[PDB]
Amino acid sequence: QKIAKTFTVDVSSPTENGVFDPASYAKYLIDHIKVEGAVGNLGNAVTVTEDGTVVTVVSTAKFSGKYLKYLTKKYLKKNQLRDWIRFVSTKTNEYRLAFYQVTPEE
Amino acid sequence: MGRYSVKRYKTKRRTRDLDLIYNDLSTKESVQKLLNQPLDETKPGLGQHYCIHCAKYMETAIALKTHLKGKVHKRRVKELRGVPYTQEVSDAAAGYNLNKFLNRVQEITQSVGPEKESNEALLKEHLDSTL
Amino acid sequence: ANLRTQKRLAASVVGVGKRKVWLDPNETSEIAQANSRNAIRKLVKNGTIVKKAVTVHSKSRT
Amino acid sequence: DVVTREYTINLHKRLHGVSFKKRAPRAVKEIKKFAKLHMGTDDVRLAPELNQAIWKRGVKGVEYRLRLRISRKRNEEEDAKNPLFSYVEPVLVASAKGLQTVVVEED
Amino acid sequence: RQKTMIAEARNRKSLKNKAIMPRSKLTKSFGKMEEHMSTLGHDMSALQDKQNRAARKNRYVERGSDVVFGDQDALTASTENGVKLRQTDRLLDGVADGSM
Amino acid sequence: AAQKSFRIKQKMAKAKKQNRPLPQWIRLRTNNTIRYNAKRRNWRRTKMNI
RNA sequence: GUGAACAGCCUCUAGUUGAUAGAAUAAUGUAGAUAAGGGAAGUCGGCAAAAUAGAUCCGUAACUUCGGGAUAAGGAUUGGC
RNA sequence: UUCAAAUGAGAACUUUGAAGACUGAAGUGGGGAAAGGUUCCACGUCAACAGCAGUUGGACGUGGGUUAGUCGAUCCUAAGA
Ligand SMILES: [Mg+2]
Ligand SMILES: [Mg+2]
Ligand SMILES: [Mg+2]
Ligand SMILES: [Mg+2]
Ligand SMILES: [Mg+2]
Ligand SMILES: [Mg+2]
Ligand SMILES: [Mg+2]
Ligand SMILES: [Mg+2]
Ligand SMILES: [Mg+2]
Ligand SMILES: [Mg+2]
Ligand SMILES: [Zn+2]
């Protein structure tokens, strides 16, 4: 019915390599998650938190991992990281940001 | 230039002008004459069942009624609303005979306009009653 | 080099049409060495041969 | 002499009146002739991305104006009949209007 | 910049005739990664450290095969008909010497 | 045809075994006058007529 | 998908990109179009083209083996929201 | 139809990649019957042939490949012989 689902994103690798900002990513999620068809209507329905390496979204109102991936890819495209960083699933409802395969220059 | 427009708007296939139709609808005597036409063997429906707005003869009263219940007739009626756009309008737009154009516009607004509207309303109710 | 046979084997092994297999233009010698479906499977595994995605036919306007 | 410039080519007047199946191939040939005229090289090589830019709107939809980067460089191969060749690249810009010939500072 | 990005994406995309290649299957170069991140303005210290560690890990060590057979070829008389060692040659098996 | 009789397949096997050029050592024999296979058959040139 | 529709037109899966090429754009051809005013004066002959066309509604003669003729003829209309 | 690379003495015509198109499921897709008989596939390879070309080929040279109690024939009868 309204059972709270938890979705986790691990941003540790891009954050450590210095091309990603978890606080900005969480703020983008807060400002761009839609509830009942509108933004800014997350009151007592969904919550987004970040501790510098893991971003957690706890939702009771129609949130899906595909939607979270769509929003994250929008954010990466906006910050011009879509060609280098991708959003992948490790287990159910836990995801990570990974780099695409890059050969050394030598 | 293209064949459709050429064979529709050939000079020998020309139709009556909107300002002429407006002059016909403005005066009550003209409307009465167009409503009571002499029997002509060369016209569809023996000269009866004539739509004044579209200037068009129908073969039957049912055909005239179906024409009145249509968008083409509504299009012509909407076209026949405002100023008839004679040559004085283009002259005034160029800056020529501006006072004459203004006098014509105020005459249409004051006297010719409402009389034409009342004639149209009487014609509409007459057609609705008889059809 | 002539990679027609390798292209056909890659299509058969991946299970798509020949229009949907991409052979790396830089690994020409490595692809030319591959004469068996086993070697083709190895090339697919290491990424020298890639399966293309289907051309989209969206139904949004429909 | 190694050099690199950016030009605008007017393909509209060059393709004026050309049969529809031949417009994009004739644009390719006109670009080769343009580079030969401006650089003095018989050997002209077009980038595949430039070929994509030419053919982007099909065989008969070639753009009126294209912004090109032409680089005259040395031919490293000894067996080649010429010591210099031109390489033509596309310059993707907001609009190809109002642009003049410029020299690109190679670094 | 927005118009330029529109033009670049239009030149890149050809979606009506086929799909775009998957990034998760393709591989790219650290030089392009460095230049793009430098354009974006990030700090390339950690990425350069990763690339240097990978380059120092990928070491080419020569072996006895490289010493002996490195430049040579053949070692086998190449047959005129491209036959295997134990394959019959209908045409040439009856003539032992190459002069004949 | 795919479903053929054994007699037809036997004649086909004989034709296949006959389809060859001359061996090269034939050309080296004393007083040899056979210089090519004058009865060579090809599938697209002369039909076997069953 | 459109559409009454295995029609025509566009697309996905799959399959092709084969048929000597390049350069110019004279006359005459082959194939395909447009044309002021008139409207068969052309020609043995309206040959050929043009015009008509789907669907809804109104309406439909002589003759007739009463079953037809008939989509007779002749009219009004058609989009989007 | 076009671009770059590879191969090669030599590339409009071969291979890969990049593009533009087409068949549009009554197909230029996927299988079979008659007929053909190795044309299938690999390696080598260009004298002749592919009405231009050719490094390519259904071409030339050398080999590999067709596995059934259940699929067919075989059995039954039809017109008939
Ligand atoms: Mg012309
Ligand atoms: Mg005319
Ligand atoms: Mg006459
Ligand atoms: Mg005459
Ligand atoms: Mg009749
Ligand atoms: Mg067609
Ligand atoms: Mg099509
Ligand atoms: Mg020839
Ligand atoms: Mg073959
Ligand atoms: Mg053979
Ligand atoms: Zn009317």
mmCIF file of C-alpha atoms in Angstrom, chain B:
data_model
loop_
_atom_site.group_PDB
_atom_site.id
_atom_site.type_symbol
_atom_site.label_atom_id
_atom_site.label_comp_id
_atom_site.label_asym_id
_atom_site.label_seq_id
_atom_site.Cartn_x
_atom_site.Cartn_y
_atom_site.Cartn_z
ATOM 1 C CA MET B 1 -0.610 29.039 -61.724
ATOM 2 C CA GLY B 2 -1.428 25.516 -60.603
ATOM 3 C CA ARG B 3 -4.280 23.699 -62.280
ATOM 4 C CA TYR B 4 -6.669 23.641 -59.298
ATOM 5 C CA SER B 5 -6.547 27.392 -58.684
ATOM 6 C CA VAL B 6 -6.552 28.096 -62.432
ATOM 7 C CA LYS B 7 -9.685 26.058 -63.123
ATOM 8 C CA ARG B 8 -11.465 27.320 -60.018
ATOM 9 C CA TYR B 9 -10.711 31.050 -60.373
ATOM 10 C CA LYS B 10 -10.852 31.383 -64.155
ATOM 11 C CA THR B 11 -12.417 34.700 -65.148
ATOM 12 C CA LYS B 12 -15.351 32.935 -66.843
ATOM 13 C CA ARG B 13 -16.024 31.040 -63.574
ATOM 14 C CA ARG B 14 -15.985 34.118 -61.329
ATOM 15 C CA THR B 15 -18.413 34.621 -58.434
ATOM 16 C CA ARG B 16 -20.191 37.654 -57.006
ATOM 17 C CA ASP B 17 -18.149 40.002 -54.831
ATOM 18 C CA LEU B 18 -18.524 40.446 -51.081
ATOM 19 C CA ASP B 19 -19.123 44.203 -51.283
ATOM 20 C CA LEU B 20 -21.926 43.621 -53.799
ATOM 21 C CA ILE B 21 -23.462 41.018 -51.477
ATOM 22 C CA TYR B 22 -23.134 43.480 -48.575
ATOM 23 C CA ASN B 23 -24.952 46.134 -50.615
ATOM 24 C CA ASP B 24 -27.669 43.576 -51.398
ATOM 25 C CA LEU B 25 -28.082 42.724 -47.703
ATOM 26 C CA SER B 26 -27.939 46.336 -46.473
ATOM 27 C CA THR B 27 -31.301 47.491 -47.873
ATOM 28 C CA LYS B 28 -34.622 45.840 -47.030
ATOM 29 C CA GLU B 29 -36.002 46.361 -50.548
ATOM 30 C CA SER B 30 -33.082 44.463 -52.101
ATOM 31 C CA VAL B 31 -33.583 41.588 -49.646
ATOM 32 C CA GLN B 32 -37.293 41.453 -50.504
ATOM 33 C CA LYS B 33 -36.519 41.416 -54.233
ATOM 34 C CA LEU B 34 -33.968 38.618 -53.809
ATOM 35 C CA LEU B 35 -36.438 36.640 -51.684
ATOM 36 C CA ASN B 36 -39.275 37.086 -54.215
ATOM 37 C CA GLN B 37 -37.705 36.242 -57.530
ATOM 38 C CA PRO B 38 -39.466 35.768 -60.874
ATOM 39 C CA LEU B 39 -39.660 32.204 -62.154
ATOM 40 C CA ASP B 40 -36.639 31.613 -64.404
ATOM 41 C CA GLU B 41 -36.365 28.362 -66.353
ATOM 42 C CA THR B 42 -32.561 28.699 -66.625
ATOM 43 C CA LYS B 43 -31.965 28.724 -62.847
ATOM 44 C CA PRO B 44 -31.771 25.808 -60.400
ATOM 45 C CA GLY B 45 -35.079 25.469 -58.603
ATOM 46 C CA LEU B 46 -36.787 27.893 -61.034
ATOM 47 C CA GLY B 47 -34.971 30.821 -59.427
ATOM 48 C CA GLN B 48 -36.352 30.026 -55.972
ATOM 49 C CA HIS B 49 -34.326 28.864 -52.944
ATOM 50 C CA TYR B 50 -31.618 31.512 -53.280
ATOM 51 C CA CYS B 51 -29.013 32.057 -50.564
ATOM 52 C CA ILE B 52 -28.218 35.776 -50.572
ATOM 53 C CA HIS B 53 -25.038 35.546 -48.466
ATOM 54 C CA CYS B 54 -23.375 32.970 -50.723
ATOM 55 C CA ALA B 55 -25.262 34.250 -53.819
ATOM 56 C CA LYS B 56 -26.189 30.699 -54.727
ATOM 57 C CA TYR B 57 -29.268 28.929 -56.086
ATOM 58 C CA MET B 58 -30.435 25.579 -54.714
ATOM 59 C CA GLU B 59 -32.558 22.989 -56.481
ATOM 60 C CA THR B 60 -34.810 22.471 -53.441
ATOM 61 C CA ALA B 61 -35.779 23.933 -50.085
ATOM 62 C CA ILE B 62 -34.277 20.883 -48.357
ATOM 63 C CA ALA B 63 -31.003 21.614 -50.171
ATOM 64 C CA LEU B 64 -31.208 25.231 -48.996
ATOM 65 C CA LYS B 65 -31.811 24.022 -45.423
ATOM 66 C CA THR B 66 -28.814 21.671 -45.541
ATOM 67 C CA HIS B 67 -26.713 24.522 -46.944
ATOM 68 C CA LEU B 68 -27.788 26.775 -44.069
ATOM 69 C CA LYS B 69 -26.795 24.013 -41.625
ATOM 70 C CA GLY B 70 -23.203 24.031 -42.860
ATOM 71 C CA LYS B 71 -19.764 25.506 -42.271
ATOM 72 C CA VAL B 72 -19.378 26.949 -45.791
ATOM 73 C CA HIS B 73 -22.418 29.168 -45.237
ATOM 74 C CA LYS B 74 -21.109 30.036 -41.764
ATOM 75 C CA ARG B 75 -17.759 30.947 -43.337
ATOM 76 C CA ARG B 76 -19.435 33.331 -45.793
ATOM 77 C CA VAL B 77 -21.634 34.842 -43.055
ATOM 78 C CA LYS B 78 -18.550 35.469 -40.909
ATOM 79 C CA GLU B 79 -16.814 37.035 -43.922
ATOM 80 C CA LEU B 80 -19.773 39.399 -44.450
ATOM 81 C CA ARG B 81 -19.494 40.991 -40.978
ATOM 82 C CA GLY B 82 -17.200 44.028 -40.987
ATOM 83 C CA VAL B 83 -16.230 46.799 -43.395
ATOM 84 C CA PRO B 84 -16.681 45.670 -47.038
ATOM 85 C CA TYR B 85 -13.117 46.761 -48.075
ATOM 86 C CA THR B 86 -13.679 48.946 -51.104
ATOM 87 C CA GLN B 87 -10.881 50.857 -52.881
ATOM 88 C CA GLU B 88 -11.144 53.712 -50.362
ATOM 89 C CA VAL B 89 -9.641 51.462 -47.672
ATOM 90 C CA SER B 90 -6.516 50.793 -49.749
ATOM 91 C CA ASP B 91 -6.305 54.487 -50.648
ATOM 92 C CA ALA B 92 -6.465 55.429 -46.953
ATOM 93 C CA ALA B 93 -3.832 52.806 -46.125
ATOM 94 C CA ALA B 94 -1.603 54.474 -48.716
ATOM 95 C CA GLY B 95 -2.552 57.863 -47.248
ATOM 96 C CA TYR B 96 -5.067 59.013 -49.876
ATOM 97 C CA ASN B 97 -8.617 60.317 -49.242
ATOM 98 C CA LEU B 98 -8.281 59.564 -45.528
ATOM 99 C CA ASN B 99 -11.183 61.834 -44.553
ATOM 100 C CA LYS B 100 -13.430 60.154 -47.133
ATOM 101 C CA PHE B 101 -12.462 56.758 -45.711
ATOM 102 C CA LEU B 102 -13.174 57.946 -42.155
ATOM 103 C CA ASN B 103 -16.582 59.306 -43.182
ATOM 104 C CA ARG B 104 -17.427 56.005 -44.882
ATOM 105 C CA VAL B 105 -16.311 54.036 -41.809
ATOM 106 C CA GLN B 106 -18.422 56.129 -39.440
ATOM 107 C CA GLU B 107 -21.422 55.872 -41.790
ATOM 108 C CA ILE B 108 -21.070 52.075 -41.815
ATOM 109 C CA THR B 109 -20.714 52.047 -38.020
ATOM 110 C CA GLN B 110 -23.733 54.302 -37.432
ATOM 111 C CA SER B 111 -26.411 53.762 -40.096
ATOM 112 C CA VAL B 112 -25.662 51.046 -42.671
ATOM 113 C CA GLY B 113 -24.334 48.473 -40.192
ATOM 114 C CA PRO B 114 -27.225 47.948 -37.754
ATOM 115 C CA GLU B 115 -29.783 48.099 -40.577
ATOM 116 C CA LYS B 116 -27.901 45.347 -42.423
ATOM 117 C CA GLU B 117 -27.719 43.335 -39.189
ATOM 118 C CA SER B 118 -31.473 43.661 -38.605
ATOM 119 C CA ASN B 119 -32.150 42.677 -42.223
ATOM 120 C CA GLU B 120 -29.928 39.615 -41.764
ATOM 121 C CA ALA B 121 -31.765 38.685 -38.556
ATOM 122 C CA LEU B 122 -35.164 39.019 -40.249
ATOM 123 C CA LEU B 123 -33.932 36.942 -43.197
ATOM 124 C CA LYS B 124 -32.610 34.265 -40.830
ATOM 125 C CA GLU B 125 -35.882 34.001 -38.910
ATOM 126 C CA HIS B 126 -37.876 33.998 -42.171
ATOM 127 C CA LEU B 127 -35.764 31.146 -43.554
ATOM 128 C CA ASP B 128 -36.022 29.214 -40.275
ATOM 129 C CA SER B 129 -39.811 29.594 -40.221
ATOM 130 C CA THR B 130 -40.416 28.748 -43.887
ATOM 131 C CA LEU B 131 -37.883 25.896 -44.017
#
